Each structure stands twice: as structure tokens, then as C-alpha cells.
Design a binder for this molecule. Structure first.
Ligand SMILES: C[C@H]1C[C@@H](O)[C@H]([C@H](O)COc2cccc3ccccc23)[C@@H](O)C1
Ligand SMILES: C[C@H]1C[C@@H](O)[C@H]([C@H](O)COc2cccc3ccccc23)[C@@H](O)C1
Ligand SMILES: [Co+2]
Ligand SMILES: [Co+2]
Lengths: 381, 381
């Protein structure tokens, strides 16, 4: 069931903003590890005395990396005279966020029809305001409300190139890397209490619950009208034998925050080949692969969707496969992106639900909890 | 003249420590950009609840990248019960350093015969103490004094593998990158006032002035007895047409700090080929090359040291060449390593002064100020 209860018109995920200590080094690492090209910048070279912001793109996926300069460079500015290109930026907020949480996602940005209306409707329906709507160069409006922890949901709307004040990056500095990643599929938060978080977010967005189908968590998924904006939220389950990974996250992150970003690839085999070649030369590492019994058991589960050779390629790359009543999901998790065991990335590709492909085709991998446990048991014996 | 006036026995540069917001991303970027392998770690996986520290090596060059975890993970510890592997580390100091200066060098570490004696002699001769001598696992002693700004000179002495508590990195995570870099040649500080800085450092070390031979600076070089530890210091010169790059550094760094690290290569042509191939795929960018007239003028200057083809290879790679009365220097500068126009890297190789090669053979490139200016003028006409 989909009541289509969005309280304002939502289009698609627009960008993810990471708050960093040094945006240059994080952006360069991510560019090489994920195959994203440098697309836009706002920094000292573009007249921005407040923050350094670098935009990477792959297909429709946009990752923004921002860090503050010394406040002394902008000490004479006031908000009406700011050289910042992102008017919600604040030196103290950014330093406090990074000191508290380490490297991580500050903003989940969605494109909407009208960011001023989305902000007003959200706040009228219980959203905690974070940054009021600001019109940039009479062309783009940006507004922010609190999502969970210190993560904001950012609304962006365009009258008609990322944001005014950003400059496109010179071709010499923009190498055309591409490992096949094409868009953000879902963005997942970890919170101490699922119920209150769901009530808050669904309360102000009108997003509906997306149907699914002891592992240490309870989860639920909120979705926009066309189910292309997908926001799962996890809470810990205490008392289990193995300590909840959600609780570990909350301890190391100093509270709620974004847990994982799931990036859709148009060719997950190519993406994983390219990312794994780079794991030990500056890129990203991947979680340990399931034992061969898991891929043995794939034949009975997905043998009508993947050939034996396609199953063998999943095994060579450590890819997991799940399936619900509508489609099939190929997925894999990276190790944490930075020093703390907090945020990580998921690479996914979905098979089925062709109408365009409907959002969330194949679910989120819930079936891989039981399958992985059984697979470990079978491999031991 | 070399009075050999060192007040304690100094061996060689040992390591450089960067203080970071996220050590993982900076270390991974530097590893790929410079061709340094991951050699040792001290982090949550090794029992360190205080800081994440990753060691990269290339030859004898050691770069350490350290960032703090949440203080909550170690809130029950006291110094006698610390899980930190570097006992001088402090969460507040590291966060304050990074907020003030951005990504940069916290420690210039030199190996000495006895770090406790070096500390005592230094402090008795005016050094400002920063961290007292601490013996680690009855095997290594570490002590720190203030050098300039918030940079420390770290003394390390070994009874007889980086430091106790560090674990060697698994072969799967240690890809054997190598672009030819072999050791740290010199480490250069920028200060507001050269005279007081020189008097302070030479006062407590006994390091002597190393002989050299409007550009916006005055400089001098301090050297150990065998002239293998080389510490140049720059001050700005005000009033010039073009604004002093030393003054720009001090403004963006919030005061004195380490300006550049000069890394010796055993094959500068190979190093630059490898680094330039990676500039736009996660590595380091280089300063704009001199015009072809500069390489035209190289024949009259160094035609007895470099063949025409070797001069052509210098031109293809943007390498500069200087020469004094004893040797020849090949050198090139990177663009700043992070967001701020502060720290950068120099790659160098020295030709001559064979006895082993004596330290500082060929100078530091002072002749390239006049040569570059004349070269720009000639290229214009
Ligand atoms: C409903 C929420 C909570 C999560 O259940 C879901 C994860 O993404 C699950 O994904 C996986 C579960 C188990 C094993 C995996 C192994 C590799 C990659 C993903 C795996 C999230 O997105 C939406
Ligand atoms: C005495 C101190 C002050 C500096 O004069 C020296 C620099 O390293 C100079 O180096 C260069 C000067 C001019 C042009 C260059 C172009 C490329 C690479 C290096 C170049 C430093 O080490 C020790
Ligand atoms: Co997921
Ligand atoms: Co130099």
C-alpha cells in the first residue's frame, strides 16, 4: 500500500554533503576509490573566504565535501555580505559536528518543487528548522530542517550549475573516472529509538512506510510518493549475544547519524572489479566475503535470475544477492569510510520491477541475515 | 665553516607526524599520491581507544597520520592507564591544532642517542618543554620540545618496530607502492621573525648555520653536526610589489608552522612521472612549469652535469635545476597538500659532493629565484 501522502512535491535525491576537516584529501580519496569526477568547486579560488567545497559526480550521484577555513579570513563579513556559497554553513557548527562525530554526512539533500514551501510545510508539521529558505542569485532556493542527530534534510529547488557561486572544474583537473555508479538509492540513519524518529520524519514529510519482504536491530523505511526517495532508519536491539552494531555506531558516532549510503550501479560487476582493484592503493575496502556455501545456496534461490557464470562472478567479487516477491537485489558493503566504525557505503543493483524500474525493487537485503547465518553454519560443518 | 656544536648526539630525521581530522582518508590519499606503503598502525584494532595513527613509509621516509577518536571512548583512562601509543597525544591539543591550522605537521621527529638527555639538555638551554621523556615498553624513549608555532621537535631514541603498541600492517592491506622517494632531506618553517626563531632553535640544539650559495622572504638554515638534519626557516619581507607568500602562509595558517617537506628521490625522473600520472586521479598537483626559455638557459648553467636528453626530461616533467660551488640540485614543488595555501611538498635529488653524499649538496634552490624571474622576462620578449 502507498497512500501517496507527501505533504509537498519531492523529486529525487539531489546530493549528499560530508562535513570534513580537510575537504581536499577526502574528496581526492573518494574520487579515486569510487570513480567519481571532480565537477564543481567553491573555495578561495572562487572568492569563497568561508568554506572549501568540492563536488564529485558519477551519473546523477553528487557528493559534496566541505571544510571550514580559518574564521579570520571572513571575520569582517556578516550574513548579508557573506562570501560563502552555502549560506547555511557555519564555522562553529562544522567544527563541532566534526569534533563530535568525525567524518560523516551533514546533509541529505532532495530536490523539491519549491524549497520555501517545503520548508514552511515541514515546519508547520513539526520539523525542527535548521536553516531558513535562502534564494541564491534569484535562481536556486535552499532550506534545511533537522532529520536525526546532527544530520539535516536539505531542500533544494531550481527556477530553471550545481549552486550559484560554484565554478565548473577545469578539464585538466577533471579526469573522467567512472566505475558505473549512477545514483543514490537510499540513505540510512541510526537512531537510539526508532518509533519517535519515524513519527517525527513521517510527520513532517508525509512520507509513507515502505513494505519489506536476533540480528541486533529493528528498522523501517520511509518513502516519497513515487518511492524514489528512500530513508531507512535503524534502532539497536539490546541484550543479544553479539553486541548490536547499531549500538556500536551510536557509541563511536556520539549519537544518531547517517549509517550508510547505498549507491546504485548500472553494472555492479564492473563497479566492484574497479573498486576492489583500488582497495589497497587509496580506495575503499570491502566487508569479508560470505563462504562458498552461500554461493552454492544462490542456485536454489536466484537460479532463475542469474546464470551459473553470473553466480560465479558474484562469488569472485563477494556480492550478496537477495530477492523478495517483486525483484532481485545485488549488494555489497564497504568497510567504514574513515577512522571511526560509523559510516560505510553499499553498492547495489536491482533487477526487475520494470514498468522505468520502480523504486526499492527487491527490498534492502533483509533476507541476507538468515541466509548469511545459515551459510556460516553450513560452511563450519 | 662547521663548528660541530650540537649539544647532544643527533642521528637522522626519523618521522614526520601530521595531525588530521580523519587520518584514514589523508593517509590513503598520501599513499597513492606519493607511492608510500602502509607499514604500521595504532588504532581501535590494536587496542588504542585514544587516537588513530597510520604510518606510511618509502625507503627511510616515515609519514605518520594521527587523528583523535571521541574522548568518550577513553573517558575512564588516566595517563598511567592510557591506551594511547603516543603518550604526548592529547585530544584537546589535536582538535585545537587542527581547528587553528588545518591539516599540517605537528611533529618533526629526529632520532637521537638518548631522548631523555636530549630533552634535558635542550630545556637547560632554553627549549620550551612540550612533552617530557616517556619510556615505552622499556625500549623506546620519546620527548618533545617546542620548535615554532604549534610544531614540536620530537626526540626518539631506541635501546636496540616503529613504536611499541604499533602493529605491522597485514600484507593484504600493504600494497608495495614505490615511486622512488627515499628520505626526508629538509623541513622548512615559516615564522613572523627569523632572528628570534633562529636564536631559540640554535640556542637549544647547538645546530649551526648552514652556508648558502626582492623575492618576499629572508631565510637561514640550521644543521646538525654532519649536516644531515637540515631545518631552514623563512620570514616574510613586507612592502614588496607582489605580496609575500610567507605572509600569505602565516595568515592562512594562523601563525608560524611547517611550510614544506623536501623529499629526496633516488630517481627524480621516475618519481615525477609516477606522481604526475596520478595528479588528477587522487594524487598531488604540481606548481606551474617554468617557460621553455628556462630549459634553454639550463644548457649554459648545467650543461656539464646533464645531457641534452636529461635536460629535455627535466623540461617534460617541470623540474628546476640549481647549482652552487659543490653540487647540483634538481627540485620541484607541489601545490598545497590540503585546503589551505599553507604546507606543500618538494621533491629533490642532489648530484655531487661524493665523499656517501654530503648533506645539503647543491643548496636549496636560491639561484632559481633570479633564474625564474629572468626566464619569465625572456619568455615574454
Ligand atoms: C531495512 C534497512 C536496514 C537494513 O536491513 C538494510 C541493509 O542495507 C541490509 O543490507 C544487508 C543485510 C545483510 C547483509 C548484507 C551484506 C552486504 C550488503 C548488504 C547487506 C538497509 O538498507 C535498510
Ligand atoms: C633557504 C630556504 C628557503 C628556500 O629558498 C628553499 C626553497 O626550497 C627554495 O626552492 C625553490 C626556490 C625557487 C623556485 C623553486 C621551484 C621549484 C622547487 C623549489 C624552488 C628552502 O628549502 C630553504
Ligand atoms: Co542498504
Ligand atoms: Co626546499
Amino acid at each position: 500500500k502507498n497512500p501517496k501522502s507527501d505533504k509537498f512535491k519531492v523529486k529525487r535525491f539531489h546530493h549528499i554533503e560530508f562535513w570534513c576537516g580537510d575537504a581536499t584529501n577526502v574528496a581526492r580519496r573518494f574520487s579515486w576509490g569510487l570513480g567519481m569526477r571532480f565537477s564543481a568547486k567553491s573555495d578561495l579560488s572562487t572568492g569563497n573566504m568561508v568554506h572549501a567545497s568540492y563536488l564529485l559526480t558519477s551519473g546523477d550521484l553528487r557528493f559534496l565535501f566541505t571544510a571550514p577555513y580559518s574564521p579570520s579570513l571572513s571575520a569582517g563579513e556578516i550574513k548579508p555580505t557573506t562570501t560563502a556559497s552555502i549560506p547555511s554553513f557555519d564555522h562553529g557548527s562544522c567544527r563541532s559536528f566534526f569534533s563530535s562525530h568525525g567524518l560523516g554526512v551533514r546533509a541529505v539533500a532532495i530536490e523539491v518543487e519549491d524549497a520555501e514551501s517545503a520548508f514552511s510545510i515541514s515546519v508547520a508539521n513539526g520539523a525542527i528548522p535548521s536553516s531558513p529558505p535562502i534564494v541564491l542569485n534569484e535562481a536556486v532556493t535552499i532550506a534545511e530542517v533537522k532529520l536525526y542527530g546532527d544530520v539535516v534534510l536539505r531542500y533544494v529547488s531550481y527556477k530553471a550549475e550545481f549552486l550559484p557561486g560554484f565554478e565548473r572544474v577545469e578539464d585538466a583537473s577533471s579526469f573522467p573516472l567512472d566505475y558505473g555508479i549512477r545514483r543514490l538509492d537510499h540513505a540510512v540513519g541510526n537512531v537510539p529509538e526508532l518509533g519517535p524518529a519515524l513519527t517525527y520524519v513521517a510527520g513532517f514529510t508525509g512520507f509513507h512506510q515502505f513494505a519489506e519482504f536476533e540480528s541486533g536491530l529493528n528498522s523501517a523505511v520511509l518513502a516519497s510518493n513515487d518511492e524514489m526517495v528512500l530513508l531507512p532508519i535503524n534502532e539497536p536491539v539490546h541484550g543479544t549475544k553479539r553486541k548490536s552494531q547499531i549500538q556500536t555506531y551510536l557509541e563511536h558516532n556520539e549519537g544518531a547519524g547517517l549509517q550508510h549510503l547505498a549507491l546504485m550501479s548500472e553494472d555492479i560487476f564492473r563497479t566492484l572489479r574497479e573498486m576492489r582493484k583500488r582497495s589497497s592503493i587509496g580506495g575503499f575496502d570491502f566487508m569479508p566475503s560470505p563462504p562458498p556455501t552461500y554461493y552454492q545456496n544462490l542456485k536454489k534461490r536466484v537460479g532463475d535470475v542469474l546464470s551459473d557464470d553470473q553466480i560465479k562472478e558474484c562469488e569472485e567479487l563477494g556480492i550478496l544477492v537477495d530477492r523478495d516477491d517483486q525483484g532481485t537485489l545485488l549488494q555489497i558493503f564497504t568497510k567504514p569510510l574513515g577512522d571511526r566504525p560509523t559510516i560505510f557505503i553499499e553498492i547495489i543493483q536491482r533487477v526487475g520491477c520494470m514498468m522505468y524500474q520502480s523504486g526499492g525493487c527487491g527490498g534492502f537485503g533483509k533476507g541476507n541475515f538468515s541466509e548469511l547465518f545459515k551459510s556460516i553454519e553450513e560452511y563450519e560443518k
